[PDB]
């Protein structure tokens, strides 16, 4: 008689990816703010892909025409959420894209960090998503692709991640990254901080970026 | 070559007394216009109760979203205040029947109590609370989505008529979204501090999460 029941799948990260996450999540780095640049850049890439699909098949935008990125800090939850209405990811995409298949750059980037490369270059090796763990103890990715159901990926590192169908609020289409911030990284929940980081690092992104400051009202 | 969309747009006349009530609401001063938010939050709470009670005996009714809540979104750039809930929503007929074509006994007497000069606050008791929206809004748009039906848009600028159409905007899972296009001298209801105090004052007993999202477009990234 449960309110609900669903299957949860747990997957091991590919060895190199686990190594990178441990390196990122544990090691001191001076400008972690670049995490937000990498996630906005990923969102922009997703919006490009749906935009170009719609040019040959407009019905692809039946799930929503607006192409944009929302940034949603929630001090009460200590979460920062980046939402886009891009092309989204199938379940296979989540499992493949986000853990089980290490690409050249995974090892290549740890290879480069030894060679004197910087962490802000994590994006040039195509593994920018993982910079999220510079500031987050846990990351949840919720995604909805056309013709597919809405899935939720999550990891606190430690070598594994889970995937399940998301029963939360339905998205029309796109991807939402929920960063559950480390205790000492709450600065990234502040309007002034988010504003300056976007102005500094994401000036060239070609889609609306909008802030929604979230506050749960007292007693509610 | 081909249109993106093609749809019928229907225009309805407001029932006579409803039209009369709206004109009174728009053209009369009241010292406590803030009660409009109480009325719309109350309507959302009712819608939420209904999908919850339905879900008891029929659990699959929450397939369109499990979370039951109310969001308030002020957008200073657009001068809109939006109230969104994940309640049971309205079918096209519910929308037409509820929002303007049928008048109840509680209209002619209330609308006459205001012509007589009563306190606008009593509007909710007479079951016409939605129309308090026009205390602060020059136009109201309602987007609604009921299980097993299409998403519809209702809209009126209170000229004696309103329109209904299938909506082609951003998809809602389920529920109702009220978009208030605010009057120029009623923009205070876009302010965070103002919204907080109104909710704290009038909606203390609403048994659902009410969440404010202060919308701010970022420099060089508008639209
Ligand atoms: O839905 C998303 C998406 C993904 C993330 Cl993570 C996001 O923050 C926002 C998004 O909209 N897509 C769909 C197609 C393009 C975009 C995407 C998909 C995969 C990568 C590669 N990275 C994934 C982990 C990695 F190993 F670091 C390498 C980048 C962008
Ligand atoms: O979708 C909604 C809903 C409607 C409005 Cl307006 C809202 O602000 C939020 C909502 O969720 N429903 C579904 C069922 C219960 C709820 C509802 C429906 C009708 C009335 C009566 N009013 C309609 C005009 C009136 F004449 F003033 C009397 C109240 C609540």
Curated annotation (Swiss-Prot), chain A:
Entry binding sites for ATP: 42, 84, 103, 129
Post-translational modification: ISGylated. S-nitrosylated; negatively regulates the ATPase activity and the activation of eNOS by HSP90AA1.
Region (Interaction with NR3C1): 1-216
Localization, UniProt: Nucleus; Cytoplasm; Melanosome; Cell membrane
N6-acetyllysine, modified sites: 49, 75
Family: Belongs to the heat shock protein 90 family.
Function: Molecular chaperone that promotes the maturation, structural maintenance and proper regulation of specific target proteins involved for instance in cell cycle control and signal transduction. Undergoes a functional cycle that is linked to its ATPase activity which is essential for its chaperone activity. This cycle probably induces conformational changes in the client proteins, thereby causing their activation. Interacts dynamically with various co-chaperones that modulate its substrate recognition, ATPase cycle and chaperone function.
Description of how the protein assembles with itself and partners: Homodimer. Identified in NR3C1/GCR steroid receptor-chaperone complexes formed at least by NR3C1, HSP90AA1 and a variety of proteins containing TPR repeats such as FKBP4, FKBP5, PPID, PPP5C or STIP1. Forms a complex containing HSP90AA1, TSC1 and TSC2; TSC1 is required to recruit TCS2 to the complex. The closed form interacts (via the middle domain and TPR repeat-binding motif) with co-chaperone TSC1 (via C-terminus). Interacts with TOM34. Interacts with TERT; the interaction, together with PTGES3, is required for correct assembly and stabilization of the TERT holoenzyme complex.
Comment, domains: The TPR repeat-binding motif mediates interaction with TPR repeat-containing proteins like the co-chaperone STUB1.
Protein name, UniProt field: Heat shock protein HSP 90-alpha
Organism: Homo sapiens (Human)
Gene: HSP90AA1
